[PDB]
Design a protein around this ligand. Structure first.
Ligand SMILES: CCCCCC/C=C\CCCCCCCCCC(=O)OC[C@H](COP(=O)(O)OCCN)OC(=O)CCC/C=C/CCCCCCCC
Ligand SMILES: [Fe+2]
Ligand code: NA
Length: 626
């Protein structure tokens, strides 16, 4: 039976669907008092049907067990004894659980008619792998209870290969390239006049870029780009923050200027101010290779920027603006769009695992003494409130990719050619938009169908009200609905992938990036030494948690954008409506467009300085689930 808008449903349908929604509202419940994320709309609890499926669980547990094995194997024999039996047990039990799944799948194939009798056993296996994860939790607690000068930062990897950044992190061009191809491609903006509190002069600029260049000429020819971390607020504490587990830590809200050469061959760092106030933060100017008395001050200044970057990327770009936005849309959808509504059918796959993983963020990562309290310099209460505040301030329309690019004046490939996130992101954004347009056109023939849809009206009301999604507004027509759906889907799939999956290759090595420093910002551009820079490096506990959590979060690829097939047993099609699924129809056209996009990105990557692969559709999950 094809999905329908409520106004066109037969009365049998209208009462069935309305009672189903009444039932949903008792199961999916809003709260703004969820532990460790106060003020952010969350599910009060994760319903049984929102627990992760066995496929996700086996994949996630597999990575976690690899990490445990790797950690135990890195220890000396005396220390390993405490954990070897427990690790061998988890490993063996995971393998047994894989075999139960494989036997169940073979059993279902041998008699599909009788496959309905297996559902309690599939849920039993779900319960079992979750219980295995609870045992991991206890083991992690025990490990933490027993917790060139950079050897310790290689040691925490065990036998995992160090990422490429471990070799290249001191390079100026690599540092600049993070701004357009790194985990946070959203902050960089064109600058036309410098902020008043960033007093970089013409002479300093020419010192770096040459006597025949100038600030005026660079600005006017669209060659100046600024990173300004002012929005970090309390994520950049005033001074020292002392904590039990990690001792004394610092973080920062710096300002950095980047410039293209006249040939636009690549972005270069020009100057860094390590805080917002120039009276207390001197200007650091990119040194020449011969200026050994400026070298270490500059390394320290870049490290200040990278400290700011992990804070901004992880709390705002990753947690606040993907995970915590998709939380609200998941809830609104389940509470207000009936399962027989075509938009429920379309959107539900894009929220698979979202409630579960976000509850995990709040319960595991955000409490006092948890991962974020260790890895991020600010007091945990400030981290929670600042990340929460960023989620509440995030404007849904202004946050749309095209709008973001235009507002930052980075949307013109002629002015800023090497910006992989922009170029690949637009291909994916536009493919999703055409899909949303085709799908909306099946079910909505007029703007009247949009405004007379009482469920959609209620959905918008919940997104604005209980969901606290800033910038969201009444939906009065088909074009607008298409833009909204494009943003919801892109946010859940591609945006998350772009900022989540760089974690293993770019964020696992603490000297290249860390959300806390063990020393204040460099007090002077000149006279610094390697020892002064090493003092910024965090304690080893920070590095240990970092390598493991960031490897995990970027190693689970579950589901795929455009596949629209269940990701757990029985793996059935998401759509039944032949108007959607027909040969050459909307879904097939979307799937085909995604393959063209993939081919285009692969061609672009042959010509790029380094491949950018995070927005390859084959590497984009449909939902935010890790
Ligand atoms: C950090 C910034 C991220 C921001 C974005 C957050 C977005 C959402 C991501 C949320 C992710 C939530 C955390 C992952 C969720 C994994 C799926 C899951 O739900 O797992 C549940 C288990 C058990 O939970 P429970 O409450 O019983 O006990 C926790 C400890 N008190 O949690 C873990 O395995 C610990 C994982 C920590 C990582 C261990 C890595 C291997 C360690 C082995 C080597 C030991 C080294 C210490
Ligand atoms: Fe994530
Ligand atoms: Na299909």
């Amino acid at each position: 039976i094809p999905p329908s808008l409520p106004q066109y449903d037969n009365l049998a349908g209208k009462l069935a669907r309305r009672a189903v929604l009444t039932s949903k509202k008792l199961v999916y419940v809003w709260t703004e008092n969820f532990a460790n994320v106060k003020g952010v709309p969350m599910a009060r609890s994760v319903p049984l049907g929102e627990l992760p499926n066995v496929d996700w669980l086996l994949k996630t547990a597999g990575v976690i067990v690899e990490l445990i094995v790797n950690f135990v194997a890195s220890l000396p024999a005396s220390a390993a004894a405490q954990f070897e039996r427990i690790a061998a047990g988890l490993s063996g039990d995971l393998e047994a659980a894989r075999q139960v799944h494989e036997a169940l799948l073979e059993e279902a194939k041998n008699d599909p008619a009788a496959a309905g009798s297996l559902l309690l056993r599939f849920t039993e296996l779900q319960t079992r792998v979750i219980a295995l994860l609870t045992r991991v939790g206890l083991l992690v607690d025990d490990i933490l209870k027993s917790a060139d000068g950079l050897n310790r930062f290689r040691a925490v990897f065990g036998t995992l290969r160090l990422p490429e950044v471990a070799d290249s992190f001191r390079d100026d061009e690599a540092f600049a390239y993070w701004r357009v191809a790194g985990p946070n491609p959203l902050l960089i903006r064109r600058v036309d006049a410098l902020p008043a509190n960033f007093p970089l002069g013409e002479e300093q600029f020419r010192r770096v870029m040459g006597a025949d260049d100038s600030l005026l000429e660079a600005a006017a020819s669209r060659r100046l780009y600024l990173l300004d971390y002012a929005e970090l607020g309390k994520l950049a504490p005033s001074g020292a923050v002392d904590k039990l587990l990690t001792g004394t830590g610092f973080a920062y809200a710096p300002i950095a200027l980047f410039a293209l050469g006249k040939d636009r061959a690549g972005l270069l760092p020009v100057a860094i101010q390590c805080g917002q106030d120039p009276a207390t933060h001197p200007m650091f100017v990119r040194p020449a290779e011969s200026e050994s008395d400026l070298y270490w001050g500059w390394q320290m200044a870049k490290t200040v920027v990278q400290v700011a970057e992990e804070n901004y990327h992880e709390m705002f770009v990753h947690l606040a603006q993907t995970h915590l936005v998709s939380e609200a849309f998941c809830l609104a959808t389940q509470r207000t769009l009936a399962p027989s509504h075509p938009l429920h059918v379309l959107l539900a796959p894009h929220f698979e695992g979202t409630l579960f993983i976000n509850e995990g963020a709040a319960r595991i990562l955000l409490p006092s003494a948890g991962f974020i309290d260790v890895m991020f310099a600010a007091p945990i209460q400030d981290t929670q409130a600042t990340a929460g505040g960023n989620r509440l301030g995030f404007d849904f329309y202004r946050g749309m990719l095209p709008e973001s690019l235009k507002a930052r004046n980075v949307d013109d490939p002629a002015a800023l050619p090497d910006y992989p996130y922009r170029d690949d992101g637009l291909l994916v954004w536009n493919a999703i938009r055409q899909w949303a347009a085709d799908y909306v056109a099946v079910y909505y023939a007029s703007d009247g169908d949009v405004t007379a849809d009482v469920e959609l009206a209620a959905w918008v009301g919940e997104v604005i009200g209980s969901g606290k999604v800033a910038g969201f507004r009444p939906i009065t027509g088909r074009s607008q609905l298409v833009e909204v759906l494009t943003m919801v889907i892109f946010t859940a799939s591609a945006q998350h992938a772009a900022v989540n999956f760089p974690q293993p290759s770019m964020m696992t090595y603490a000297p290249a990036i860390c959300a806390m420093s063990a020393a204040p910002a460099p007090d002077s551009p000149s006279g610094k030494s390697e020892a002064d820079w090493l003092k910024m490096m965090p304690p080893t506990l920070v590095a240990l948690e970092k390598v493991n959590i960031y490897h995990l979060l970027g190693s689970v690829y579950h589901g795929r954008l455009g596949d629209y097939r269940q990701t757990g047993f029985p793996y059935a099609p998401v759509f039944s409506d032949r108007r959607v699924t027909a040969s050459g129809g909307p879904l097939e056209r979307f799937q085909a467009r995604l393959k063209e996009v993939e081919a285009t990105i692969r061609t672009r990557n042959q010509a790029r300085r380094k491949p950018y692969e995070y927005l390859l559709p084959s590497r984009i999950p449909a939902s935010t689930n890790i």
